[PDB]
Amino acid sequence: ANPYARGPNPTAASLEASAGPFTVRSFTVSRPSGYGAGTVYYPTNAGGTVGAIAIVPGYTARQSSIKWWGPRLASHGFVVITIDTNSTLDQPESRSSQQMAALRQVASLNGTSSSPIYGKVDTARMGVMGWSMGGGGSLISAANNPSLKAAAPQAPWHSSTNFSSVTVPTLIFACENDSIAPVASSALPIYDSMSQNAKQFLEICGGSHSCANSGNSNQELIGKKGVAWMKRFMDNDTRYSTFACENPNSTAVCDFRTANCS
């Protein structure tokens, strides 16, 4: 049996729901180490240790922009840290360093007896997500740390679109009508550069640059795909293989690509 499988067998309905099967609590990180601020979301009743995911906002943005992922992922059996950066004007390399510092601190707290997440984390299984420059920072994190088990940036941007070095399973969310980081010059070239990995590209119809942020009108589809990708690749959970690899039946899909998915 897969030692990392958690929760009941998935269905479309269970993955499109606002909440997964586990109860979620959260806390503010008291002494952020290497980044500006953080909130940790965690399941109280997962029934084994779970992987950790670190999520970074874009330029000028704060945890509010990405917060919805915390409950959505934690409720399916993950510890999720959403961060504020040391400066709202930090660039991708700095955002990647701070994302990795946030994962380091989740590992520290997993060994801290006073922490709500004491003994809840499998510190060998980590993932990265983020918006825009925080998405570019996630891809830098993956390139630099190939032991990361999954990446799922949204509307990514970086100063270079060449992520051919990435060997981590990577799902790119893109927003059709993005005027900040146009799909044709940012997300799609980044996707096309990646030759060595399981990868997927999902572009949301009519979406502005914020189409995968807190308050979006496609949480059913976006949340299904993000949780399926992370379950498949962070937990090796092949119960999620079809949800992770499929072209989903949604009016909201305006571009779909996938390679090396199983």
Curated annotation (Swiss-Prot):
Involved in the degradation and assimilation of the plastic poly(ethylene terephthalate) (PET), which allows I.sakaiensis to use PET as its major energy and carbon source for growth. Likely acts synergistically with MHETase to depolymerize PET. Catalyzes the hydrolysis of PET to produce mono(2-hydroxyethyl) terephthalate (MHET) as the major product. Also depolymerizes another semiaromatic polyester, poly(ethylene-2,5-furandicarboxylate) (PEF), which is an emerging, bioderived PET replacement with improved gas barrier properties. Optimum pH is 9 for PET film hydrolysis. Optimum pH is 9 for PET (commercial drinking bottle) hydrolysis. Optimum pH is 6.5-8.0 for BHET hydrolysis. Optimum pH is 8.0 for the hydrolysis of pNP-esters. The enzyme is active at pH 6-10, has an optimal pH range of 7-9 and it is rapidly inactivated below pH 7.0 or above pH 9.0. This is Poly(ethylene terephthalate) hydrolase. Induction: Highly up-regulated during growth on PET film. Belongs to the AB hydrolase superfamily. Optimum temperature is 40 degrees Celsius for PET film hydrolysis. Optimum temperature is 30 degrees Celsius for PET (commercial drinking bottle) hydrolysis and BHET hydrolysis. Optimum temperature is 35-45 degrees Celsius for the hydrolysis of pNP-esters. Remains active even at 65 degrees Celsius (about 60% of maximum activity). PETase retains the ancestral alpha/beta-hydrolase fold but exhibits a more open active-site cleft than homologous cutinases. Keywords: Disulfide bond, Hydrolase, Secreted, Serine esterase, Signal.
